[PDB]
Amino acid sequence: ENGPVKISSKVNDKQVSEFLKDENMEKFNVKLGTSKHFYMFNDNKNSVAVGYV
Amino acid sequence: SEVPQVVSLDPTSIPIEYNTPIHDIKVQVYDIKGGCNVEEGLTIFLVNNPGKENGPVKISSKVNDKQVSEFLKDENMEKFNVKLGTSKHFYMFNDNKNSVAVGYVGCGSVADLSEADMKRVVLSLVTMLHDNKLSKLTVVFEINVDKNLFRFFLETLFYEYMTDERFKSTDKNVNMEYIKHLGVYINNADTYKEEVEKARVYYFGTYYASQLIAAPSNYCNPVSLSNAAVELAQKLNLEYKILGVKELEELKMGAYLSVGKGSMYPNKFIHLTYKSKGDVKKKIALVGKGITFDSGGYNLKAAPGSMIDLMKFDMSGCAAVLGCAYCVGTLKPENVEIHFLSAVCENMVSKNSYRPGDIITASNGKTIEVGNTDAEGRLTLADALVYAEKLGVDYIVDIATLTGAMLYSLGTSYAGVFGNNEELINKILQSSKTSNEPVWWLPIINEYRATLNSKYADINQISSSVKASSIVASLFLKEFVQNTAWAHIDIAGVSWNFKARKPKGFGVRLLTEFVLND
Amino acid sequence: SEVPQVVSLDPTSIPIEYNTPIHDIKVQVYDIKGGCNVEEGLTIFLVNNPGKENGPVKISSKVNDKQVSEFLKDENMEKFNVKLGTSKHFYMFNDNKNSVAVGYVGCGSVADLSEADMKRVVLSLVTMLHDNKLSKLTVVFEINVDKNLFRFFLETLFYEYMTDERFKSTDKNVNMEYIKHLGVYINNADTYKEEVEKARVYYFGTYYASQLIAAPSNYCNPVSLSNAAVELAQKLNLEYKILGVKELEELKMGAYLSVGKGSMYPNKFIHLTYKSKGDVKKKIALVGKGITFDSGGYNLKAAPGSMIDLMKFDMSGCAAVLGCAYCVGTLKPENVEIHFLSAVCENMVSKNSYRPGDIITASNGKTIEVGNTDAEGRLTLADALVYAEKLGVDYIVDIATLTGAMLYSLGTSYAGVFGNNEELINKILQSSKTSNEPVWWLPIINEYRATLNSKYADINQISSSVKASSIVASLFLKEFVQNTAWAHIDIAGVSWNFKARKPKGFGVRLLTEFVLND
Amino acid sequence: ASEVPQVVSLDPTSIPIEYNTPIHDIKVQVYDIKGGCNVEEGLTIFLVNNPGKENGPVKISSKVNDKQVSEFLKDENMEKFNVKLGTSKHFYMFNDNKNSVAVGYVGCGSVADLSEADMKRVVLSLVTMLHDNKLSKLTVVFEINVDKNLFRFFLETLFYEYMTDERFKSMEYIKHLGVYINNADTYKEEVEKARVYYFGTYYASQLIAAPSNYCNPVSLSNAAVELAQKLNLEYKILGVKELEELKMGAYLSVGKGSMYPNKFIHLTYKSKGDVKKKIALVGKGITFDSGGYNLKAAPGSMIDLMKFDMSGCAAVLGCAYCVGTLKPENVEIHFLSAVCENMVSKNSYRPGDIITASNGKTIEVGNTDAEGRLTLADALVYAEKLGVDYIVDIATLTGAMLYSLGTSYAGVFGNNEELINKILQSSKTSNEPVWWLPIINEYRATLNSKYADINQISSSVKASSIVASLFLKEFVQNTAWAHIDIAGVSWNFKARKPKGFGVRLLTEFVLND
Ligand SMILES: CC(C)(C)C(=O)N[C@@H](C(=O)NO)c1ccc(-c2ccc(CO)cc2)cc1
Ligand SMILES: CC(C)(C)C(=O)N[C@@H](C(=O)NO)c1ccc(-c2ccc(CO)cc2)cc1
Ligand SMILES: CC(C)(C)C(=O)N[C@@H](C(=O)NO)c1ccc(-c2ccc(CO)cc2)cc1
Ligand SMILES: [Zn+2]
Ligand SMILES: [Zn+2]
Ligand SMILES: [Zn+2]
Ligand SMILES: [Zn+2]
Ligand SMILES: [Zn+2]
Ligand SMILES: [Zn+2]
């Protein structure tokens, strides 16, 4: 109940894959409706926004 | 001094949290003219754009990190705007190949932020702190604030960040993880450092009052509330005195005692005193309304909109006075003697309750005709004001959730102040500006005094005609201050925060600024 | 166990009539094929004419009397119609030169009689019994009824025929002369013979509950009601246990104890148990709401339409459970263990009452914020459900006059059932079908659960916005059943018969059918 | 002048207006108190007080040039009466010349400085004696201390309360008024100013007291034209077609359900010299406020009082009389009122309707009984288009004023500190009390409509007087603007008549600033 976030999908981007690591995503919980998004640069130095709900 | 019970499961004390997680936060203030270090936790820039209504974000501070500085370049930041309350999070790696979290909170397009604007900025910051297990928060002030507004930022941050879990059993937040360090970068840092610990003191005084108000009436009763006042005075080395029924019967406080006749909890009059080391130059009496629960009496709160379930907050005035007593006892001002007073009782329905129509005698000899048992606050305040003036003070200031009419005059943001002395009212307004607790001056219209003319008693408690309840109530209280500068703050409309479903602790910082800046 | 009094004239026990005159009626059921004998008393034919909306009455049964059969010829009977509720009386001499009385009651044109329709014909029959000093009544079934509807005919006949005179002093019987014999002619006398004594047991269980409900709150208080429950268990050789305040405090039943704090009568928890001599295959707990009077507390029932004068019926759930205890204790089913529970108390206004806003702790550790003292049924039920689940049963079924919103959903005829288990809900609906006490399944909408999220306590007692009170209350009750099949029957709309100004005894036969037909 | 529509031939088609009142025939004489008082004819009343002695005895200090009256006013005789505020006694006797005279006093309490409310009690006691006196002259001897402004207020209140409105009805008035007061020469210039201020207030009272069948949008605008013609003011009455061309959708929506077409009153006073200040005065002109489909049916809504919902318009028109008569210089004043009637009909606007104001802003109507701010919105847009320095509106806008300031003090809101200070200063010199209330910007978000540009009302915030001020603020873009809410102070419930509140306050604002 309100456990940590764990991303299981493989992301074909090293920068995003590092962001979605378990140690990083465990700081967020899965309570219904809770969400966070971050802005970052991907492998091609392009601005991307990644998050969860 | 120990609380009667109906069943053994009835609580016998108010749970009070003294050592809050806010007190465990190490606060450091650095000057911006030396670069910002982005290492651990979350770093938030408070940015604004004067003129350009929702203009782009521009970071002006020098960042001592090549990777982070490149991320924060204007070409990168131009996709975000500075709309008041808006916030964004950034993920990046710093020079040491470490993952860092950076972001901003929009502060609008006006250079001077109001207390409402700063509250909206702080609330956006708290949203970033919630549901995120960060260890450190760093705030970089790219906006323009004086010492008072900077302190207000810290108080509001501490207050909104704090979560009250005293009454949670099986539903405590499993993910509650407060930060342990707070870093602040601001121009001219040496001048702002003295506001940090003052904000921490102001925060807890407000939070302490919030703890007393939010505590339900079965936990917070006249006995348990006065017990907490003794414990607070003992921790601060203040003089304290609790007047019981036998003493109150002998001060002939018939108006105050009549209100509590129907309660299972005996009346308790709180009298805390802070005396200064050296020559006392100002003597001040602070009076707080202390109705631990206001059922209305036989004039029961049964009409639609009377909100009887909120009436645990009817001791908000007492809580504000007690919260001010903490700040004064901690900061220890000089050349001042302050009395913290509250005639605490409970307004209940019973065979022993006082009835509508009853004629009672105040401690100054004035007979009062009770027209409405739900107008009990002015009755308890009447005897408290007579007690206060007998101390021979320079100023008497009372604060009370007195009249629901405040919602139709000033609303939920501004409290009303009445008084018999222009200079004292000016000091209160003046303190409202520096404490950022808004207050508006309302008149004591003498033409309405005739509606309090009783046919049998000396004076009526209530008017049967005039609907200006806040003014008529002020006219009643004025009859119990004979020759002393007196002011009256009605906080019935501003005490409770209905959006957040929690008390505000309103009045603590205002009363403290009044005492400290005299 | 001793009822406290204010004055010596206060009653100390509930007058209960176990000996009803209905029990002195000798019932004989004969087969329609062997002919009907018309000798003494009144003989009534229940006639129907399908298709023909109000077509003529036609007696099809063979009458073993030449004189009577000639009168009952079709040419004579064609002047009467079969409209539902209509009735006629005939005077004649039989073969045998004796005066006899014959008549009929119209049963409409539909072949399948409703439970409401059967009540309407039965009420017409009782009117013929009233104001008539008859010694015997004979009913000739010229309609099609199954065993359950035939038993329902007898139960309803016995119930409406009986008149409660426990509280009449100077305005008593005068002309009250019950019949001593009841004859029934029907195809299958044989399978309907076993329904006679079952109807008599079901009748008294319903009438016993009606006696407790109709008993005013000065007669039926928490002490006197539990005393009557002990007396009933002793007469049926059931295990019984009444938990006093000291035991309830040790069990930490804070929600239940808070409701009764303002009462002069101590709380009493009723626990009756029926176990079979064989292997127990199913364990069932039946929970009844036992508010002997619901003033509403400080949320006083003062709004228009709140009907505070009816609130002696707020223990209808407890009365139904006790009435079911009589039926189960009398018929003695096998392979079943039944617990009869009721957290009995009184909701009053006093200096000792619990207040709106109070935070109380249930026996499962959950803290509850009281938003309305008039929502006290769910507070007492919360601790009763925790107690019930601790017994380790297969089914928990509670019945309560919980929410007035039932009048706007299902009305005065159909009760609502909520639950967390489809199999239990289906069994309740099946027993509702066989007992002919109508119940309708209503949903527990989980989207409304968020409105019970308290800011300070674990859960809110009430929702402040959603007006679907029957569903919100069901959401509250669900929080106190963790891992057991549970159903909740709200009888607030169907408990009282306003046309007849008397209780219905609703739920006795439904709960008994549920236990027996498992 | 348009034609007033009727349902039946017995419906009135004009408002009866009394221009030449008996007050205008009263010759006022002011003498200095230091020369003694002559008691020869009529009724002589002394205004006496006793400082310190709470309800102390009456003591006459002035020398009266009559032996019989002097004996009557001796200390031994007057000590039997007390000076409690409002208490009065008058006696009838023969003077030295064997003429019937009436002598008496009115108690002025124990405080030296009388408030405007205190002066009202003294005047009301005086008027009670005048309504029971067939004598030809009344003489008032001021043995108390009043400044020039309060003395003028005394005369205005005396004239106003003395006058009796008998227009709807199917003692004799005095012909002379004598006043004895210290420094008579400085108070003499206030006499004719009080008479002008009196009629401006009484004229407004006649319009307010006139029932809604007599005072309708057509008949009220006709009366404004007749008044403007008598005062040589420029006038212009905008009809529905012109209002449609000006796209006054908010104002027109309120009057859709009325049988009387909307009429926009625009009077102008220009000075002969160089115009240095331009002022626009806007008055709410709802001739009857039934509430619309949000009908005033709740207990205490007082639908029978709602003929007074044009009190703001009456105050502006009453100010037009004072300005047109006194003729100030270097000023150009516009008198505006968007007059209509809020009724229930198949043609009425509905709760939830979205309408478009003349400045393009779409408004979502949440309550048809909040119609004053809708008509004021279009009137404020009209006012700012005139290019004035100050816009001051006066309106019976919010019933919440009864719970904030009550029935004595009106509330003033605004967007400009200098204008609020001028209004507060005019309230002090006119003795019509007003209190400054804040426009709390934190409440502005509650007017954010989901579909329209702005909400007409808040569904949550109960600070209705402040919320209404926030709505009005959205229709003044770049002009100093003030708003006076007189919903609580317009009607005198004890006397069952209007007060004419705002006439003297608005006139002093024009004359002094
Ligand atoms: C005599 C009279 C006019 C009934 C009165 O003023 N009563 C007092 C009182 O009960 N004791 O002073 C009172 C105090 C506060 C409120 C109040 C405040 C905010 C809210 C939030 O909706 C709801 C209610 C209502 C009433
Ligand atoms: C929370 C709220 C909305 C106050 C509530 O649901 N209250 C309960 C209650 O008191 N539970 O303990 C309640 C139960 C029954 C009736 C009721 C039933 C039939 C009739 C006959 O017309 C009249 C009244 C009213 C109220
Ligand atoms: C609808 C809302 C927002 C509550 C409102 O404020 N409505 C206005 C209005 O009708 N505006 O057009 C309003 C104006 C005056 C009174 C009023 C004044 C005095 C008296 C006598 O005591 C009785 C009633 C009531 C209401
Ligand atoms: Zn109260
Ligand atoms: Zn109170
Ligand atoms: Zn209840
Ligand atoms: Zn109940
Ligand atoms: Zn209106
Ligand atoms: Zn209006």
Residue numbers in the entry:
A (entry chain E): 138 to 190
B (entry chain C), C (entry chain B): 86 to 603
D (entry chain D): 85 to 254, 261 to 603
Relevant lines from the article:
The inhibitor binding modes were well conserved across all active sites and subsequently from here on in the molecular interactions of 3 with the active site is described only for Chain A. Analysis of the X-ray crystal structure of PfA-M17 bound to 3 showed that the position and orientation of the compound was similar to our previous inhibitors with the hydroxamic acid core coordinating to the zinc ions in the active site. The two zinc ions are coordinated by the hydroxamic oxygens, that also form hydrogen bonds with the conserved carbonate ion and catalytic residue Lys386. In the S1 pocket, the tert-butyl makes no interactions with the body of the protein, but the amide carbonyl of 3 forms a hydrogen bond with the main chain amide of Gly489 as well as a water molecule. In order to reduce polarity and improve water solubility, compound 3 was targeted. This compound possesses a 4-hydroxymethylphenyl group in place of the 3,4,5-trifluorophenyl group present in 6 l which reduced the cLogP from 3.6 to 2.5. Overall, using this unbiased thermal stabilization proteomics approach, we have shown that compound 3 is selectively targeting PfA-M17. We also found that loss of PfA-M17, either by knockdown or treatment with 3, resulted in multiple hemozoin fragments that were representative of multiple digestive vacuoles within trophozoite stage parasites.
Leucine aminopeptidase PfA-M17 is one of several aminopeptidases that have been implicated in the last step of this digestive pathway. PfA-M17 is a 68 kDa cytoplasmic enzyme that forms a homo-hexamer in its active form, with optimal function at neutral pH, similar to the pH of the parasite cytoplasm. PfA-M17 uses a metal dependent mechanism to hydrolyze the scissile peptide bond of peptide substrates, removing single amino acids from the N-terminal end of short peptides.
